């Protein structure tokens, strides 16, 4: 029996209003599951998978304008948070109780990643620089800074000594966590990024395009190996899957396109999501696929090992 | 308008203190004062128009 | 368009939205500071952010980015950690040398000055920044003159402008040189039931100061004078305070009833917390003076529910405490919650003190110096003068 | 092939916050070299360069606000200072004390400069006149009138009889003190001038504008001879030098050009400050250059003769 990747659920009003930012964790073994959602109306809602559906954990807030990122820690049960008004928070997933809220000034911070073993929060800023925050501990450890542009979209990688930084011009710049050394800068596109992905095992980075080309890339050298040309309008994110076989995309032409990197094509095509999706993301495994689009629908596919 | 009078004690304990409120900026945000008098909020007429 | 319909919660929203599509632009993060700045200012953190941000990312929107986020700062109160260079007196006097043209600059220079002087009185110092009211409102008139047409938008500057120079003149102190401004407008044009109230205003300062007994005649003339010009929340909460002075308490209350139902209907949140917490301490402190009559403490008990209804101001639990312990003194319940007011923190400094004045005072009354030495102690880990100097003058009598 | 430019002294902090004018006195017969400062606070620090180092002399204060002019004479120890406190005390500079006070809103005073005698310290008014008042002689003895906008420059040609006047949205204005007949009105930049100045001997005024141009005008007639266009952001002031080859210039980029009107080209440019330049001025002899800027700082260069 072929099982084919199907719609399973649809959750009809998540939000009053657009969601933008969605982060799946299998931090606890047991039934957790954690899903967290930032949807522009400065709420950050925790919701859990518990056998087939989504039950709402609860809504917690404090925030001034439009949550822009969110991130989940796969070491220690923790969240945090990004709005625009670049004030930064962390919450306890156990009694929604904002253990710390890093400040910080006009231009500090525009979206988040944890450390693997969640311990830096790598960050962006409005005029280049990527500076760091210790996580829980200190404020500020250092700030890696470049020339440049607005840095939209900020990667990390998995293992370590990488740290990938997408910006508005559409040029990438990676830096080895290790020392702070530009390792090499890869001209990219003539438009932004929006999204940076590593692989697992990062041997292979993948860069998402506002001009609708997805463009794939190797850690060793700037050789541009790839080059994905089915979304008719801009693409938002991209996500991959524990083994390197395939990756979610999420266009803003309201279509969701899962690419493989062996063939380099579209595998399968999604038509849901009346409105744009800004929102991607793999469960523990292969398996469940999660979309967060501008309408208030929280949308869970199935895509089998 | 129904009494027009009311009679009170002004000192009426020398330990206890009068309450002042005076209060800062269109958010809510209030203080207290020592020194008896009027209420004296801030920004009377309100935001200017800008 | 959204605002055509009157949502007002959606614009700010759009706006948001537009921006983070966009993140450049400084001219979008302007905007969106301007319109948190008009519409939903309780976001006054995030305009002043905003603000900041479009600044930043250029030089030449200077002018109107600076101004937005003086305005939202000015919002805002004094929420900061008494930092210099970046009070709101600094970033609107940075505007102001931006561009010298637009007449708002000027009128925030006003408000700026004022609440200056509020701070300085809270922290009880000195007044400073006295006489420049009348300069500020000369340039904000000739600035004025110089705008094409945005006819109703400058007459609201004007007419602002106007009444918060009266207002400056009257706090400073010099009375003749307002009544002089109101004299020589009043005779440029006919009446206009506006200015009249600040007419009335400057003339009932020097009485009322000093205790006296008023004529039916003016009072009656008062409250008709408030009566012309109606719908304005401020005006009736000043007539409030007017019969509280001379001492007609109900009266008031009816006053302040009437603005809250005003600000009610007009959709504003700041005025009706105003209302109801000036209610609220008007029968506390007429229950003071232990009357009789015992309704006053049922309107301190709604009042102050209704205003933790909307939101969480400190000052309306210390107002329940203060009618618990006044009202049944009592023993655990008063001790407990001015304990648990002066103990979890953000609190603001005055009512912690004034609730560790009372439980000190309630803590003595039934003796236990162990606590009462937690008191002393959690004093000095504080600055304080008045609890541990009183406490000592009667700890031995 | 340029001579030998540097910087002697830099001073950490002088104020707590921007300063916003600066003029330079050899007042006294002996080389005597005072530099007062403005900033945004009341301070009005009295600086004295002596051998190799600013030394604070004065602290004197007054003022509630911000101060946005102050002045320096030649002839007498006396100076000068407005803000927007709607007061233009002038002080004593040998006792550190006020000498007067006069009452004057952004309707009767904005920018200060004083009379090639120093006896007569006209400023800029807000309805496009220029008032002259009277030092130790009291108050407006006259107006000059142009029909105009805000008007924001003042200067005097070192001869006398040449009074110039720059104004929001471009125009010049040209008048001769001695029957106070307005010569000409050139039409410049279109945006706010904010800086103007004479040359030794009165045959050259050079303008700056908001739009980072430098107009070379030629007196007694209305004669351009070039645009100076090096800067890449507003300029905020233009000092000329002692001798009639060069002028100094400040941008708000963050740079301190130096031009030489021979050739109309930049011959050094200064890349020392971190924030906007908010004053330039020669000394004496011309050979060093102070700055002052919104950062806290004070340059002293050096410009060999």
Same mark, same amino acid.
């Given at each position: 029996?072929?099982?084919?990747? #199907?719609?399973?659920? &649809?959750?009809?009003?998540?939000?009053?209003?657009?969601?933008?930012?969605?982060?799946?964790?299998?931090?606890?073994?047991?039934?957790?599951?954690?899903?967290?959602? #930032? +949807?522009?109306?400065?709420?950050?809602?925790?919701?859990?998978?518990?056998?087939?559906?989504?039950?709402?954990?609860?809504?917690?807030?404090?925030?001034?304008?439009?949550?822009?990122?969110?991130?989940?820690?796969?070491?220690?049960?923790?969240?945090?948070?990004?709005?625009?008004?670049?004030?930064?928070?962390?919450?306890?997933?156990?009694?929604?109780?904002?253990?710390?809220?890093?400040?910080?000034?006009?231009?500090?911070?525009?979206?988040?990643?944890?450390?693997?073993?969640?311990?830096?929060? =790598?960050?962006?800023?409005?005029?280049?620089?990527?500076?760091?925050?210790?996580?829980?501990? #200190?404020?500020?450890?250092?700030?890696?800074?470049?020339? #440049?542009?607005?840095?939209?979209?900020? =990667?990390? +990688?998995?293992?370590?000594?990488?740290? =990938?930084?997408? =910006?508005?011009?559409?040029?990438?710049?990676?830096?080895?966590?290790?020392?702070?050394?530009?390792?090499?800068?890869?001209?990219?596109?003539?438009?932004?990024?929006?999204?940076?992905?590593?692989?697992?095992?990062?041997?292979?980075?993948?860069?998402?395009?506002?001009?609708?080309?997805?463009?794939?890339?190797?850690?060793?050298?700037?050789?541009?190996?790839?080059?994905?040309?089915?979304?008719?309008?801009?693409?938002?994110?991209?996500?991959?899957?524990?083994?390197?076989?395939?990756?979610?995309?999420?266009?803003?032409? &309201? +279509?969701?396109?899962?690419?493989?990197?062996?063939?380099?094509?579209?595998?399968?095509?999604?038509?849901?999501?009346?409105?744009?999706?800004?929102?991607?993301?793999?469960?523990?495994?292969?398996?469940?696929?999660?979309?967060?689009?501008?309408?208030?629908?929280?949308?869970?596919?199935?895509?089998?090992? | 308008?129904?009494?027009?009078?009311?009679?009170?004690?002004? /000192?009426?304990? /020398?330990?206890?203190?009068?309450?002042?409120?005076?209060?800062?900026?269109?958010?809510?945000?209030?203080?207290?004062?020592?020194?008896?008098?009027?209420?004296?909020?801030?920004?009377?007429?309100?935001? /200017?128009?800008? | 368009?959204?605002?055509?319909?009157?949502?007002?919660?959606?614009?700010?929203?759009?706006?948001?939205?537009?921006?983070?599509?966009?993140?450049?632009?400084?001219?979008?993060?302007?905007?969106?500071?301007?319109?948190?700045?008009?519409?939903?200012?309780?976001?006054?953190?995030?305009?002043?952010?905003?603000?900041?941000? !479009?600044?930043?990312?250029?030089?030449?929107?200077?002018? $109107?980015?600076?101004?937005?986020?003086?305005?939202?700062?000015?919002?805002?109160?004094?929420?900061?950690?008494?930092?210099? $260079?970046?009070?709101? %007196?600094?970033?609107?006097?940075?505007?102001?040398?931006?561009?010298?043209?637009?007449?708002?600059?000027?009128?925030?220079?006003?408000?700026?000055?004022?609440?200056?002087?509020?701070?300085?009185?809270?922290?009880?110092?000195?007044?400073?920044?006295?006489?420049?009211?009348?300069?500020?409102?000369?340039?904000?008139?000739?600035?004025?003159?110089?705008?094409?047409?945005?006819?109703?938008?400058?007459?609201?500057?004007?007419?602002?402008?106007?009444?918060?120079?009266?207002?400056? *003149?009257?706090?400073?102190?010099?009375?003749?040189? !307002?009544?002089?401004?109101?004299? $020589?407008?009043?005779?440029?044009?006919?009446?206009?039931?506006?200015?009249?109230?600040?007419?009335?205003?400057?003339?009932?300062?020097?009485? %009322?100061?000093?205790?006296?007994?008023?004529?039916?005649?003016? *009072?009656?003339?008062?409250?008709?004078?408030?009566?012309?010009?109606?719908?304005?929340?401020?005006?009736?909460?000043?007539?409030?305070?007017?019969?509280?002075?001379?001492?007609?308490?109900?009266?008031?209350?009816?006053?302040?009833?009437?603005?809250?139902?005003?600000?009610?209907?007009?959709?504003?949140?700041?005025?009706? %917390?105003?209302?109801?917490?000036? *209610?609220?301490?008007?029968?506390?402190?007429?229950?003071?003076?232990?009357?009789?009559?015992?309704?006053?403490?049922?309107?301190?008990?709604?009042?102050?529910?209704?205003?933790?209804?909307?939101?969480?101001?400190?000052?309306?639990?210390?107002?329940?405490? @203060? %009618?618990?312990?006044?009202?049944?003194?009592? !023993?655990?319940?008063?001790?407990?919650?001015?304990?648990?007011?002066?103990?979890?923190?953000?609190?603001?400094?005055?009512?912690?003190?004034?609730?560790?004045?009372?439980?000190?005072?309630?803590?003595?009354?039934?003796?236990?110096?162990?606590?009462?030495?937690?008191?002393?102690?959690? !004093?000095?880990?504080?600055?304080?003068?008045?609890?541990?100097? @009183?406490?000592?003058? @009667?700890?031995?009598?």
């Amino acid at each position: 029996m072929t099982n084919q990747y #199907g719609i399973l659920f &649809k959750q009809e009003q998540a939000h009053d209003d657009a969601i933008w930012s969605v982060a799946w964790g299998t931090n606890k073994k047991e039934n957790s599951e954690t899903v967290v959602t #930032g +949807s522009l109306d400065d709420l950050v809602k925790v919701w859990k998978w518990r056998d087939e559906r989504l039950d709402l954990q609860w809504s917690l807030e404090g925030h001034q304008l439009g949550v822009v990122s969110v991130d989940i820690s796969h070491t220690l049960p923790i969240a945090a948070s990004s709005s625009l008004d670049a004030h930064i928070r962390l919450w306890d997933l156990e009694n929604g109780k904002q253990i710390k809220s890093i400040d910080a000034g006009p231009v500090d911070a525009w979206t988040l990643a944890f450390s693997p073993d969640s311990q830096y929060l =790598a960050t962006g800023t409005h005029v280049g620089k990527v500076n760091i925050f210790g996580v829980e501990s #200190g404020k500020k450890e250092y700030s890696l800074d470049t020339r #440049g542009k607005f840095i939209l979209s900020i =990667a990390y +990688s998995p293992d370590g000594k990488y740290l =990938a930084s997408g =910006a508005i011009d559409g040029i990438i710049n990676i830096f080895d966590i290790a020392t702070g050394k530009l390792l090499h800068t890869l001209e990219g596109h003539a438009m932004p990024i929006r999204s940076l992905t590593f692989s697992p095992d990062s041997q292979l980075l993948v860069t998402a395009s506002d001009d609708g080309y997805i463009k794939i890339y190797d850690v060793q050298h700037a050789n541009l190996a790839g080059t994905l040309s089915g979304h008719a309008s801009w693409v938002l994110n991209v996500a991959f899957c524990p083994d390197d076989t395939h990756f979610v995309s999420s266009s803003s032409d &309201k +279509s969701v396109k899962v690419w493989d990197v062996g063939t380099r094509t579209c595998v399968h095509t999604f038509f849901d999501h009346q409105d744009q999706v800004w929102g991607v993301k793999y469960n523990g495994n292969g398996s469940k696929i999660v979309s967060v689009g501008d309408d208030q629908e929280i949308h869970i596919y199935d895509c089998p090992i | 308008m129904m009494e027009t009078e009311r009679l009170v004690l002004p /000192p009426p304990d /020398p330990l206890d203190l009068p309450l002042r409120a005076v209060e800062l900026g269109c958010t809510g945000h209030w203080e207290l004062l020592n020194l008896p008098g009027a209420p004296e909020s801030s920004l009377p007429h309100g935001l /200017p128009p800008c | 368009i959204y605002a055509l319909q009157g949502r007002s919660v959606a614009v700010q929203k759009q706006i948001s939205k537009a921006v983070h599509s966009n993140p450049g632009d400084p001219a979008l993060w302007s905007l969106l500071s301007r319109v948190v700045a008009q519409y939903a200012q309780r976001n006054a953190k995030g305009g002043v952010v905003a603000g900041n941000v !479009a600044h930043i990312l250029d030089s030449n929107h200077g002018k $109107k980015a600076l101004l937005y986020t003086a305005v939202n700062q000015l919002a805002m109160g004094s929420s900061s950690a008494e930092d210099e $260079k970046n009070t709101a %007196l600094k970033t609107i006097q940075k505007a102001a040398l931006l561009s010298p043209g637009d007449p708002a600059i000027w009128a925030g220079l006003m408000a700026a000055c004022h609440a200056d002087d509020k701070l300085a009185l809270v922290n009880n110092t000195q007044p400073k920044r006295i006489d420049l009211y009348l300069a500020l409102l000369s340039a904000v008139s000739a600035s004025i003159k110089d705008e094409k047409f945005f006819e109703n938008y400058n007459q609201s500057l004007e007419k602002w402008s106007l009444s918060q120079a009266v207002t400056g *003149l009257i706090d400073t102190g010099r009375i003749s040189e !307002a009544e002089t401004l109101c004299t $020589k407008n009043l005779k440029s044009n006919p009446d206009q039931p506006a200015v009249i109230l600040l007419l009335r205003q400057v003339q009932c300062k020097p009485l %009322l100061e000093s205790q006296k007994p008023l004529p039916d005649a003016v *009072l009656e003339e008062l409250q008709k004078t408030v009566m012309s010009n109606s719908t304005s929340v401020p005006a009736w909460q000043w007539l409030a305070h007017v019969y509280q002075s001379q001492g007609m308490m109900r009266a008031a209350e009816m006053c302040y009833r009437k603005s809250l139902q005003l600000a009610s209907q007009r959709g504003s949140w700041s005025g009706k %917390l105003s209302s109801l917490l000036r *209610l609220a301490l008007l029968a506390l402190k007429v229950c003071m003076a232990n009357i009789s009559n015992d309704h006053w403490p049922s309107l301190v008990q709604e009042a102050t529910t209704e205003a933790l209804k909307l939101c969480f101001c400190p000052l309306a639990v210390l107002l329940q405490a @203060l %009618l618990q312990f006044k009202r049944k003194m009592g !023993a655990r319940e008063t001790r407990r919650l001015l304990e648990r007011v002066v103990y979890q923190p953000g609190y603001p400094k005055s009512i912690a003190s004034t609730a560790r004045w009372y439980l000190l005072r309630h803590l003595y009354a039934k003796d236990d110096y162990e606590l009462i030495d937690v008191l002393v102690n959690n !004093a000095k880990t504080h600055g304080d003068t008045r609890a541990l100097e @009183l406490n000592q003058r @009667l700890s031995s009598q």
